[PDB]
């Protein structure tokens, strides 16, 4: 049970890293609006190409652009593979919790019925009419 508290925080921090790296994707794949794109001096600034002029090879800014996009996509795959496993493991722990808890609860109502018949009163017939029904049988069987 102490563990059940512990993983949630890990999930809480694990999930947060994911959201802004999708944001980090947007902040590295443009704003996805060509018709506003120009106002930021459309990538290749007019000044750059007229700077080229004599030219003679160009800027490796496209190279880092490709490389940076490649990296973040890789990490995307890594976490998603790791993320999917986590929920599956969590639910197994969640399921195992339920089996453990219910197990003793059904087991619990055993000793108590005994002391209900030690008393100086009570005789034969009260037991047998109630032997077949002391608790609604239905061991709650995850009822829904």
């Amino acid at each position: 049970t102490m563990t059940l508290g512990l993983m949630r925080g890990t999930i809480h921090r694990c999930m947060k890293f994911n959201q802004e790296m999708y944001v980090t994707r947007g902040i590295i794949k443009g704003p996805l609006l060509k018709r506003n794109l120009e106002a930021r001096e459309k990538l290749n600034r007019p000044l750059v190409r007229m700077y080229q002029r004599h030219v003679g090879t160009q800027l490796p800014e496209a190279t880092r652009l490709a490389q940076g996009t490649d990296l973040l996509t890789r990490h995307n795959l890594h976490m998603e593979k790791n993320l999917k496993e986590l929920r599956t493991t969590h639910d197994n722990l969640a399921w195992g919790l339920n089996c453990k808890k219910i197990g003793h609860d059904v087991d619990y109502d055993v000793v108590r019925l005994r002391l209900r018949q030690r008393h100086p009163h009570v005789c034969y017939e009260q037991a047998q009419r109630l032997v077949n029904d002391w608790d609604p049988p239905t061991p709650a069987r995850s009822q829904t």
Partner: protein, 438 residues
């Protein structure tokens, strides 16, 4: 062309936008039906409305704003009102669950499956627009629903739209009045998330709004009708440059270039000078000199900040109505010669003037006076760090005694994010202090 889109996040921010959109129709010829009289102004949607409303070939003016809310009560109630036929049905973005004042609950639990829908709304509004200077974000710092949902959407609209302007307006937390002790928690959460994305954030406080009401407007028992009206006038004034013309016309882009000195800090202060009762305006006179003194009178600010405890950086004047540059340039020169007025030595000039000849109009069944000469006092001063100063020694207490954390850690946060903001704040005041040092 010259148009924009307004955003109204939080049920607190929807009755204000309601009033603003009520005000806007009171100068655009608008009838509650949705059409003009037989007079010819309808067409492809190109006239004074084309910047504000969308009156297509159907002849019905479609406002360029979206009301988003998460409690159906008010939004359905306003969906049954007088202008609801004008309001586009699902532009009135409603919700069935609240955020429990919890910024994160409004940012993580429900905002995921709702933002995609509103993202569809903005693009279908973005495409129909032509120039779309920017966005008019109406929210609130102490937002039960305004706080969390806005932060995600402003982030989402920032990443896909990172070039156009974004105008932010929120009721600032009352310095001494707190309807909720959870308000500071989310308020700093909003600020730190927005400092690196928000373009121009404008703040306001209701207490001194009320203080004005019984000082010169002389109303001891006003209402939001009055409260919503006056901020609606304020936003109407700043938008008058789009609606009308003047000796010189200015745009929001010039404001951001000239108002904010340095990055991060983008928190100027607005103020409307001719705030007076009708009878007081009746048997008295208005001119540039006294309204200039009034707009620089420290008690006329809706913000609890003493300008003599701070120092000025900017002062933007938007004169709407009949005025001439002569007395304007003469009066401001006297203001420059005033010694109590303490700008920083860094700025020789800090005066942004906008002249508009349209005389501000009254509202039917209104409370304002009869204005011919009006000005909005947009300024930034160093007397504002106390506002962030008061909340930290507020906040540092509760975080040390970690009140209500079980609520927030209950639905999935941790303390690191709360940690980050405090030195982010500690960075803010020292930046305020360092720039305050000349």
């Amino acid at each position: 062309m010259r148009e924009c889109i307004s955003i109204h996040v939080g049920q607190a921010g929807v009755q204000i936008g309601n009033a603003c959109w009520e005000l806007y129709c009171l100068e655009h010829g608008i009838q509650p039906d949705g059409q003009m009289p037989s007079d010819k102004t309808i067409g492809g949607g190109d006239d004074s409305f084309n910047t504000f409303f969308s009156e297509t070939g159907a002849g019905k003016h479609v406002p360029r704003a979206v009301f988003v809310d998460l409690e159906p009560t008010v939004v359905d109630e306003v969906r049954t009102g007088t202008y609801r036929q004008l309001f586009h049905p699902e532009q009135l973005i409603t919700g069935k669950e609240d955020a429990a004042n919890n910024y994160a609950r409004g940012h993580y639990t429900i905002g995921k499956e709702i933002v995609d829908l509103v993202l569809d709304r903005i693009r279908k509004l973005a495409d129909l627009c032509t120039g779309l200077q920017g966005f008019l974000i109406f929210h609130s710092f102490g937002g039960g629903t305004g706080s969390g949902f806005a932060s995600l959407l402003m982030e989402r609209l920032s990443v896909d739209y990172g070039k156009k302007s974004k105008l932010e307006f929120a009721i600032y937390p009352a310095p001494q009045v707190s309807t909720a002790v959870v308000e500071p928690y989310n308020s700093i959460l909003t600020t730190h998330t927005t400092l690196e994305h928000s373009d121009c954030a404008f703040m306001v406080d209701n207490e001194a709004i009320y203080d004005i009401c019984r000082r010169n407007l002389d109303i001891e028992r006003p209402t939001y009708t009055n409260l919503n009206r006056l901020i609606g006038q304020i936003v109407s004034s700043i938008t008058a440059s789009l609606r009308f013309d003047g000796a010189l016309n200015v745009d929001l882009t010039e404001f951001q270039t000239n108002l904010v000195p340095y990055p991060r800090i983008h928190f100027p202060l607005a103020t409307y000078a001719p705030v007076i009762s009708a009878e007081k305006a009746y048997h008295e006179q208005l001119s540039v000199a006294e309204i200039t003194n009034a707009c620089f009178e420290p008690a006329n600010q809706m913000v609890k900040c003493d300008p003599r405890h701070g120092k000025y950086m900017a002062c933007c004047m938007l004169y709407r109505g009949d005025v001439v540059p002569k007395d304007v340039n003469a009066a401001i020169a006297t203001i420059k010669t005033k010694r109590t007025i303490q700008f920083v030595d860094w700025c020789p000039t800090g005066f942004k003037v906008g002249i508009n000849y349209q005389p501000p109009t009254v509202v039917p069944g209104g409370d304002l006076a009869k204005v011919q000469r009006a000005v909005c006092m947009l300024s930034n001063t160093t007397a504002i760090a106390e506002a962030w100063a008061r909340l930290d020694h507020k906040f540092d207490l509760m975080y040390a005694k970690r009140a209500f954390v079980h609520w927030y850690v209950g639905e999935g946060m941790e303390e690191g994010e709360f940690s980050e903001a405090r030195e982010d704040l500690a960075a803010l005041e020292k930046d305020y202090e360092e720039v305050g040092v000349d």
